[PDB]
Design a protein around this ligand. Structure first.
Ligand SMILES: CCOP(=O)(O)OCC
Ligand SMILES: [Co+2]
Ligand SMILES: [Fe+2]
Length: 329
């Protein structure tokens, strides 16, 4: 009791986050896009109503908090998050940092200047809203570009100044987490402040337990992603992959059986609109997983319990681990 985390409706006690999905999106977009072209999504209103329905579904399934890891360059719209959060009655933590689509006004910046940007969003507020970020989001897709190295150092420095954790996009098959960890540690950032994300996109347990052993959180955060049955759709296939959700969920069990229950975070990487990909991708997605952000509580948790993972363990994963991660430290 007494430890606080920032949400888009203001500060909440850590102990009130409850069942928390630590890597999700309301809308996967680009900076300025929802302002310039809202009809792409039907309308902003159609978008918000879809999002509220989704989050109410997740809520009815026991989800109390999502961490929306949309950065600036994912076109994060913190006013939109606040509105859907209020209407659905689900807590949303917003993000600072940069994903892998930074425009030139960011790409030209120094590590110092990025640190000041990330600190602004955490300590002052995003835009003119006063809504403060409660997590820093970074990305690589393979070996870090030169600019990506600065982003990761700036994320570490902002995290050390504020205690707010860092979470990452990886290309899991290329084992990005190992270079991310090296860079974070060169800045003196504690591995317990760091989640290495999209780690369920691989079945390489040597890679995963190696990170877990060093104290990193391992984000198994793309649960409902499977393109099985969708072989004739090259865009669906490249994005969702050819492994089933049961295969992804088996990784959670594998890490628990190897003693790493406290190093796991689970999520969907779901969204309610998606302009940064092919047109109509959202129809394909909703067909594959009509449960949205309830898929984890409805399908994954009972699959684990039936594999014999104890209720306490499953609570520790979905409640205690996010609370410990999000708590400024
Ligand atoms: C907004 C899209 O972000 P991502 O987590 O990189 O991938 C979503 C499939
Ligand atoms: Co990602
Ligand atoms: Fe994501």
């Amino acid at each position: 009791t007494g430890d606080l985390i920032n949400t888009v409706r203001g500060p909440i006690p850590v102990s009130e986050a409850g069942f928390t999905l630590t890597h999700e999106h309301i809308c996967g977009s680009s900076a300025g896009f929802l302002r310039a072209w809202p009809e792409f999504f039907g309308s902003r209103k159609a978008l918000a109503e879809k999002a509220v329905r989704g989050l109410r579904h997740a809520r009815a399934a026991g989800v109390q908090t999502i961490v929306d890891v949309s950065t600036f360059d994912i076109g994060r719209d913190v006013r939109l998050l606040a509105e859907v959060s209020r209407a659905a009655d689900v807590h949303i933590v917003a993000a600072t940092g940069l994903w892998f689509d930074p425009p030139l006004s960011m790409r030209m910046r120094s590590v110092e200047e990025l640190t000041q940007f990330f600190l602004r969003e955490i300590q002052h507020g995003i835009e003119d809203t006063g809504i403060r970020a409660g997590i820093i989001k970074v990305a690589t897709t393979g070996k870090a570009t030169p600019f990506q190295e600065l982003v990761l150092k700036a994320a570490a420095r902002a995290s050390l100044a504020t205690g707010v954790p860092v979470t990452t996009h990886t290309s899991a098959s290329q084992r990005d987490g190992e270079q991310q960890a090296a860079i974070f540690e060169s800045e003196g950032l504690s591995p317990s402040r760091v989640c290495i994300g999209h780690s369920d996109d691989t079945d390489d347990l040597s890679y995963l337990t190696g990170l877990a052993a060093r104290g990193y959180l391992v984000g198994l955060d793309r649960m409902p992603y499977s393109a099985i049955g969708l072989e004739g759709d090259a865009s669906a296939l490249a994005l969702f992959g050819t492994r089933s959700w049961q295969t992804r969920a088996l990784l959670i069990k594998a890490l628990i059986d190897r003693g790493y229950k406290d190093r796991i975070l689970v999520s969907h990487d779901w969204l309610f609109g998606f302009s940064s990909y092919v047109t109509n991708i959202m129809d394909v997605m909703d067909r594959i997983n009509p449960d949205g952000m309830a898929f984890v509580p409805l399908r994954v948790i009972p699959f684990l319990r039936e594999k014999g993972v104890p209720p306490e363990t499953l609570a520790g994963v979905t409640v205690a681990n996010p609370a410990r991660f999000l708590s400024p430290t």
